[PDB]
Amino acid sequence: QACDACRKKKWKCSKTVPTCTNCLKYNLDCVYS
Numbered sequence: 001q002a003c004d005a006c007r008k009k010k011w012k013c014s015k016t017v018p019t020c021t022n023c024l025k026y027n028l029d030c031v032y033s
């Protein structure tokens with residue numbers, strides 16, 4: 001599945017920590033669940 005960030009915006013995620021490339025880009029709280 002996508003990370004919490006790509007889950008609210010739906011931008012698909014690569015599933016990598018700490019922050020997915022999408023969170024380190026827009027600088028957001030990357031969380032998982």
Ligand SMILES: [Cd+2]
Nearest residue numbers: 003006013020
């Ligand atoms: Cd993501």
Ligand SMILES: [Cd+2]
Nearest residue numbers: 003005023030
């Ligand atoms: Cd994220």
